[PDB]
């Protein structure tokens, strides 16, 4: 409703870097808000694509941003008569970024790993990896929970059980308020998907450069399964956190598995032990239900509600035709330990191939009326297919059915405007929460400032 579409701020990264692929707000220890931007195809020293991270201070004018440097060299360790290898070429550093406290976590889901032993090997695979930074102090750490030292032959003997070689950890990520890093790894367990969790403090206190393989005793990973419903489900394609069990001492995880059950799609809500509390099933095969998930209380009852995006949902048209437009589902959390039940509201895109629901961002209370609001991206929507972001306001019964505001992409065709969104943070400190929108196709980020309601 009251975002300002007239006076925007633009940040930019290098050509071809995909600057804006991921982003988040970051508070330094002095309470000053900045923007962390992932750019997964940024060139490294080797002249090859490795990815990179940028830390943009707030400036109405925008502009270029200081790099946030991470070690981009391949590592080799000859230990225990084995050879451990990391490969950072095309690792996609910055394919996801998240901030917690004074720490930034930037992930490289396609970082590769191998282990050689004489003529045998583990196989060169994308275990993925996460880089952690404390910008003010300069401290650095890494977290790569899916790395192993088991040889290929052993996996064959066990029918490829507990196979974490293709995890792509950091594909998605989120941090709990208590500082527990949670990584989605959709390739985990031979493409079932898995989650990996570890306190940020313990990652920092256990990490030493050069080791590559070390124990994090407090870490916790989800489990393999022999239920074919889960096969190739990409459980962990998206993740979020919230409160869904009535115990405020505990954080619950929301996990998207967009291809669960032969591409039906699913989203699950679990406790921090990965015990399932709810399962939401997709409505239509191949719609990618679970591509994106968002948690926020939209109807002002103090209970977190769930939003699920299915960007490839095909709406029924006249003459028994189907039109791919994308769809978003709202599930209101009931009072008590009851089941979420059917969707309370269905929001459906209008532009063919627009991919409405690709990203869903809590905005907090944008218009300051007592109900939290959301923004929904359609990266290829709008009358000209350049991309649109639609704002929906909360209300006592959930969300409004019609958007209060529509932001048209200020970039050229193919920018993927809205692929990434982040709201709910007041960056200019004017008392209204603001919205940042990534457009990696144009290597830029756009900031929309909220203003007093006209």
């Amino acid at each position: 409703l009251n975002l300002d579409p007239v006076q925007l701020t633009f940040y930019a990264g290098p050509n071809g870097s995909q600057f804006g692929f991921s982003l988040d707000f970051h508070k330094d220890s002095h309470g000053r808000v900045a923007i962390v931007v992932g750019a997964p195809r940024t060139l490294g020293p080797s002249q090859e694509e490795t990815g990179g991270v940028f830390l943009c201070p707030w400036r109405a004018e925008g502009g270029q941003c200081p790099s946030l440097l991470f070690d981009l060299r391949d590592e080799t360790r000859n230990v225990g008569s084995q050879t451990l290898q990391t490969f950072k070429a095309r690792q996609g550093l910055g394919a996801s970024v998240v901030s917690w406290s004074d720490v930034i976590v930037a992930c490289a889901p396609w970082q590769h790993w191998n282990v050689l032993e004489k003529t045998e090997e583990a196989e060169k695979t994308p275990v993925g990896s996460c880089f952690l930074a404390q910008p003010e102090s300069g401290r650095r750490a890494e977290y790569s929970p899916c790395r192993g030292n088991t040889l290929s032959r052993i996996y064959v003997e066990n029918d490829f059980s507990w196979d974490k070689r293709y995890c792509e950890a950091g594909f998605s990520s989120v941090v709990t308020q208590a500082g527990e890093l949670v990584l989605g790894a959709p390739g985990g367990y031979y493409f079932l998907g898995l989650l990996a969790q570890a306190p940020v403090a313990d990652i920092f206190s256990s990490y030493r450069p050069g080791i590559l393989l070390w124990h994090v005793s407090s870490q916790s990973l989800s489990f393999d399964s022999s239920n074919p419903e889960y096969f190739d489900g990409y459980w962990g394609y998206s993740v979020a956190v919230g409160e869904f069990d009535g115990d405020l001492n505990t954080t619950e995880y929301v996990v998207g598995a967009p291809t669960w059950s032969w591409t039906l799609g699913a989203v699950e809500i679990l406790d921090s032990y990965y015990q399932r509390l709810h399962r939401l099933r997709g409505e239509q095969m191949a719609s990618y239900f679970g591509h994106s998930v968002a948690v926020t209380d939209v109807n002002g009852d103090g209970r977190h509600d769930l939003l699920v995006g299915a960007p490839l949902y095909m709406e029924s048209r006249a003459d028994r035709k189907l039109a791919e437009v994308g769809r978003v589902y709202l599930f209101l959390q009931p009072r008590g330990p009851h089941a979420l039940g059917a969707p309370s509201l269905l929001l459906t895109g209008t532009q063919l191939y627009g991919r409405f629901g690709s990203a869903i961002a809590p905005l907090g209370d944008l218009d300051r009326d007592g109900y939290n609001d959301i923004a929904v991206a359609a990266p290829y929507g709008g009358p000209s297919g350049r991309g649109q972001v639609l704002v929906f306001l909360g209300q006592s019964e959930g969300l409004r059915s019609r958007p209060s505001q529509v932001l048209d992409s200020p970039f050229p065709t193919g920018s993927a405007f809205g692929f990434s969104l982040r709201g709910a943070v007041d960056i200019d400190d004017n008392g209204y929460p603001d919205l940042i929108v990534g457009a990696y196709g144009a290597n830029q980020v756009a900031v929309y400032r909220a203003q007093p309601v006209v």
């Epitope: 360790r77 000859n78 230990v79 225990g80 393989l213 070390w214």
Partner: antibody
Framework: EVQLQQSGAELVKPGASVKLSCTAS????????VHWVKQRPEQGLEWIGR????????KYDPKFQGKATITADTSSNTAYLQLSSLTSEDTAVYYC????????????WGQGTSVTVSS | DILMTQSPSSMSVSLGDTVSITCHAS??????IGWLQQKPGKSFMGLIY???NLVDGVPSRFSGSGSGADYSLTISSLDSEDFADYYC?????????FGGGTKLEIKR
């Protein structure tokens, strides 16, 4: 607190066998590699081998092949070192060891078990 | 097998002194070395892992260094508790192998 609690001193006659124990306390034995080490006053320290209690896979220094056998019992959070056909050469103190962070390191040690061979 | 040659086998030093213990390997082990302490009649305590990293809880007066095939353990300002046996261990290759040991003794 991570602690390796080993069994008591052993007195064994030549040619006999003996089985030493290493019980994990404050953690699960499946967490890391568990190594066994032999110490003598003159010859010093010698790595015997290791096991991954999670799967039972072992490694040995070929010098102890046929003499030492390492096993684990996750049910009782314990790792074992079996010495067979004992000679005076086997009189020594035996330690079990596990790493702290580094997968391959040798940081935490049990208090040691004395084995004395005599008829 | 890799041979670890530790020097010296013993040293007579004084409280408050700074002392360095060295270890030479028959081939490059790329910091894959640990340092161990054994007080009189006691068991072992880990000091260093991977060349330079203090085990959690180890006094700051201890430090490790080196590269290739040569490494050092250095104790700055000896405490009374530091008079003990020290050993290096390499785990670059199976079998793991140990140095011959160094005994710190009181000078008089």
């Amino acid at each position: 607190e991570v602690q390796l609690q080993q069994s008591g001193a052993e007195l064994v006659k030549p040619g006999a066998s003996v089985k030493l124990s290493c019980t994990a306390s404050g953690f699960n034995i499946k967490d890391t590699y568990v190594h066994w080490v032999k110490q003598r006053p003159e010859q010093g320290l010698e790595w015997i081998g290791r096991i991954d209690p999670a799967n039972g896979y072992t490694k040995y220094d070929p010098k102890f092949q046929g003499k030492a056998t390492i096993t684990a019992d996750t049910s009782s959070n314990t790792a074992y070192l079996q010495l067979s056909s004992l000679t005076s050469e086997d009189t020594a103190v035996y330690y079990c060891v596990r790493p702290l962070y580094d997968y391959y390191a040798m940081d935490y040690w049990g208090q040691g078990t004395s084995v004395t061979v005599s008829s | 097998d890799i041979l670890m040659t530790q020097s010296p086998s013993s040293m007579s030093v004084s409280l408050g002194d700074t002392v360095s213990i060295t270890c030479h390997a028959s081939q490059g082990i790329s910091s894959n070395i640990g340092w161990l302490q054994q007080k009189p009649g006691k068991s072992f305590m880990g000091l260093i892992y991977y060349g330079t990293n203090l085990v959690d809880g180890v006094p700051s007066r201890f430090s490790g260094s080196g590269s290739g095939a040569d490494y050092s353990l250095t104790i700055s300002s000896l405490d009374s508790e530091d008079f003990a046996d020290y050993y290096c261990v390499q785990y670059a290759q199976l079998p793991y192998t140990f140095g011959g040991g160094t005994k710190l003794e009181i000078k008089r």
